[PDB]
């Protein structure tokens, strides 16, 4: 008997890897929101 | 295995790009508020 | 991919446009205050 | 798109209109002060 | 739209009305000063 | 499709209507201030 | 729809009512000033 | 087929009904603020 | 073969129809909020 | 394949259309506030 | 040969029928949510 | 030799035929779900 | 065939019933907020 | 020849009969879910 | 359906009640200002 | 023939019974959320 | 040998065809949600 | 509603009361001026 | 069926209870503001 | 962008204009004082 | 072996295509909100 | 419900109390002005 | 049959218990906001 | 003849018995989810 | 990333520009006050 | 259930405490104004 | 017969155990949100 | 004996291959959602 | 007789073993989701 | 069962801690305003 | 694992950067107010 | 059995770590708002 | 961070500059008063 | 909890300190007025 | 956990720093007022 759940070990790793990309780039756009929101609040402020 | 989360890299970029447009033009109108508010405060001032 | 945030470009422009109207006409009434205040201060003055 | 800030044009106008009434009638009472002050100063004068 | 600044028309009128009372009665006392001053100056005169 | 934003047309109208009442009666009390202020200034004047 | 801005009609009325009291009694003290000022000016006069 | 969104017609109506109560009674307290503010401004005035 | 997705055409239509009712009557209550909010802001205003 | 997102094109348009109505009529009431505020400030002014 | 899928025609109909009941009465409770939410928003509003 | 699999040709056809009925009427009930779900989502929405 | 969706009729009713309790008592606490907010605004007011 | 598939006619009927019981009582518990879900959503709501 | 916005009727009433207390006692201190201001103006007067 | 779906009648009943417990106790915790949320909103309020 | 999976080619095509209808009409109702949501957000907005 | 502007009635009264004291004692010193002025004028006279 | 929304009745009550504490103690600090503001205005006054 | 502060240019001008009227007519009464003072001093002179 | 997931390549593309339409037109209505919100804030501003 | 605006009753009282101190001591310095003014007028007198 | 939903009774209780901790400590920080806000308003006040 | 389906009576009973264990202990873990979810919602709440 | 706050640079500039107009023309009317005050003081002088 | 709003009792107390410090020290500077104003008025007096 | 659902008793226990870890550590990050949100609200506050 | 599960090795590989295509292109459309959601949130934001 | 279900004992054990690997590594990716979600919520938060 | 909401106890504490820093340093700048305002009022005073 | 919140580090920086621009240019207009206010106060002064 | 929720322990930690970065840098921009707001209030102040 | 309050340095300077103009020219008219007063006193003298 | 209003203690002190400078130097110029007024009165005297 | 509110410590410091500049230069212009007022009072004096 056996079952080489080793390719899982690896392939799941890439899953993690891309979620790091989407997880990152996604944040890149939340910053534009964030900053544009800081500026919006800056203008309406004074 | 694989998963080309490369079109994400790009497409998210445009998301950023338009948020820069809305983020910008939006501000364009906060300025009208801002300035019209400076002027309003100018008139009520004296 | 894409996203035509071009109608934004325009429509936000009208937003600016009317805020110019309200921004203007509003001031029209602050002048009545202003002037009626100059006159009030004229009368109480002498 | 659009936004009929035309009723503003008009309604703000009446705002101006009544401020002309208050602005006027108000002055009517500053005259009583004014004149009664001229007379007061007339009497204390001689 | 509207704004009945008609009760203003009236109420301001009474404001005028009482200022006529104070404006009058006030003068009543400036006369006592006035006359008592004429008499004072009459006595010190001769 | 559709959406009868007609009851809005009307109901908002009453909103306007009562704001005319509060907008009016409110002014009724600013007149008491106003006039009592004219009289106060009348008395302290002479 | 509706909105009974009728209790406003009334309650604002009392606001007017008390401002008439303060507006009156306040004047009561401006008279003491007034008269004591007439008398002061009477004494310094002669 | 069907769907009797008739009990909606009614029940939403009561929603409107109570919002008229809260909408009204709420205003009842803004009047106390309002009037007590007129009086406060009356006293600090003279 | 076949599949008469014609009763869908119709029945979905009523779905639209009632959502127009809820979509409408719902708005009816947002107006009470809206107007009662205009009035609330009217009172706290002056 | 396909997907006629054409009824969207239209129906969203009406959404825009009514928001223009609410967007307009709403403003109608902000004017009553606005003007009643100009007048309020007119009275407290003099 | 044959197969009388006629009792289907009918029985499925009742399925529709009760889903109209649940579909209706269910909505009855979403209205309580809805309205109680309008009122909640009414109170927190002013 | 032979084998008249012709009655198959036909009888299977009716099988198709009724599956069109069940296939249709079944959908009739998924619409009640569907629409009642649109309405449910309409109510919880606003 | 059949399906007694009658216990639904009833049980859903109680669901409505308790939502009336929570819907009510909930409001009870929004009033404490409301009133304590009126009072807070009363104190900061004068 | 023959085959009395008449006891089928009947016995299948009871099968239907009990499925009506399970079909019913089952629903009885989906209502507790349903209502407890309406209430849960009521509480988290306000 | 229903919603007992009756505890609102009452509780809002107390809100009014205390605002009458703060509204009153607050005024109590504006009188000390007021009178101490009359006296101050009395002394600087003569 | 037969099938005693009577133990179903009963056992499903207990299912209902415990869902009443979970349905209840669950709510017990939504109240802590609820109230702690009222208090949180109380503090941030003033 | 053989197997004419040609009627599949076609019949699956209609499957696609109706899913285009449901896929379309379904969207028709999401627009009512959508727009009624834009309007709802319009009203609560101002 | 209400507003007990009764403590005003009283407290303003004391304001009057002390202004009578200052108003009196003040005069006490204008007499010393007065008389010392009569005497001064007596001496320079002869 | 059932749902003991009785612990709600109670627990919400405490929510009310503490909001009375925060609602009270909060006011305690608005008084320090209030009074320190009366005194500040007392000093700048004379 | 923009802001037509042109109606200001004009309206302020009228403010100037009336202040010229009050500024003038006011002087008209200071002349009566002036001259009546010259005459008063003429008489007391000889 | 094989599997022509090429029609996927294309059909998914249209999915993208319409989401661009809804994604666009949707924004068209957020602009009406946006601008009507700028204007609303313009009016309440002055 | 409730709201113990009793600590207000008291704390506002101290506000009154200190305003009596400032109100008093303030006057103490107006007397130095007053008297030094009587004396100044005494000296310049003769 | 059975189902010991007794560990629920207990475990849910702790859920309540910790929400009391978070519910409490959370408030601890809203007080720092609160008080620092009272002080901020104290400083900007005078 | 015969068939002692009595060991079924019993053995099925244990099946019920363990499903009560799994049915219970399973719930034990849904509570950890449940409570940890209440707490999670507690923290994100305030 | 980015955010072209360049239109701000400019538009704020015009705000400055008009405030220069109002700032100027406003002064134009303070001169009429000023001069008419010099003249008033000239006449009352001699 | 519960909620220890006891740390509120205390922490709000310190808020009061520091407002007493700012409330006090603030006054310390209004005295410098006050006195320097008495002296200024002393010098310009004679 | 039998079935040792004893390893369930245990293994489910660990499931509970780790959910306590995730349930805990998860909260650890909601605190960073929480606190960073308190601080964010602290800064925007004053 | 034997069994060449080698064509499996390969054919499963293509399965992986296309799932990479669908897995990829699928994501292509989630980006349109994603970005259109960022933009939607951008507009509703300011 | 016999049957060595001992290799089951073992082989099932490895099944458990790998499910621990997949069960673990799987979680590894839910953490990236989790954390990237905490961060996403961090950014949109402030 | 359990849930160590102990790291909350602590971490929330730091939240309090920094809000004390911002709460403090913030005040540091309100003092510059405060004092510069005392001085400004000092200069404009005399 | 990981998450490159480094683009945040940077992009937030620009947010700061533009807020420095708006923060600056905004002030540019408060100076026009400021100075025009100094001049206004200069003219009304003498 | 087992489940190494140890990588959770760690990975969640980084989640905390970056939220500290965003939590920090975010604040960096609220300071620019804060300070630019102090300065804005400084200028409009005097 | 930063904030270029350098344009303040300059712009305030011009404020000073014009106040020097008004401050000067104003004096120019006080001289006409002054001298015309010397001459007036010259004539009435002899 | 806490709040170090100690930097207030100090910074307010300097506020006092400079007001002593302005309070002093200001007086320095009132002396020039004073003395130049004594001398003016000396010359016009004889 | 943590939160480096250290950049606050610093950045707020500059806020203080510029308010010292505006706080200073502002005063620079109040001196021109001040002195030009001393001179104005010098001229009108003699």
From Swiss-Prot, chains A, B, C, D, E, F, G, H, I, J, K, L, M, N, O, P, Q, R, S, T, U, V, W, X, Y, Z, AA, AB, AC, AD, AE, AF, AG, AH, AI:
Highest taxon of the lineage: Viruses
Kindly state which keywords UniProt assigns to this record, in alphabetical order.
Answer: Capsid protein, Helical capsid protein, Host membrane, Membrane, Signal, Transmembrane, Transmembrane helix, Virion
Q: What is its main location?
A: virion
The listed locations are: Virion; Host membrane
How does the entry describe its membrane topology? Single-pass type I membrane protein
**Side Periplasmic, residues:** 1-21
Query: Which cellular component terms (GO) are annotated to the entry?
Result: helical viral capsid; host cell membrane; membrane
Cytoplasmic compartment: which residues?
43-46
TM ranges? 22-42
Report the sequence similarity comment from the record: Belongs to the inovirus capsid protein family.
Summarize the protein's role.
Answer: Self assembles to form a helical capsid wrapping up the viral genomic DNA. The capsid displays a filamentous structure with a length of 760-1950 nm and a width of 6-8 nm. The virion assembly and budding take place at the host inner membrane.
On subunit structure and binding partners, the annotation says: Homomultimerizes. There are several thousands of this protein in the phage capsid.
This chain's protein is named Capsid protein G8P
Protein's organism: Pseudomonas phage Pf1
Q: What is the lineage of its organism?
A: Viruses, Monodnaviria, Loebvirae, Hofneiviricota, Faserviricetes
Q: Which gene encodes it?
A: VIII
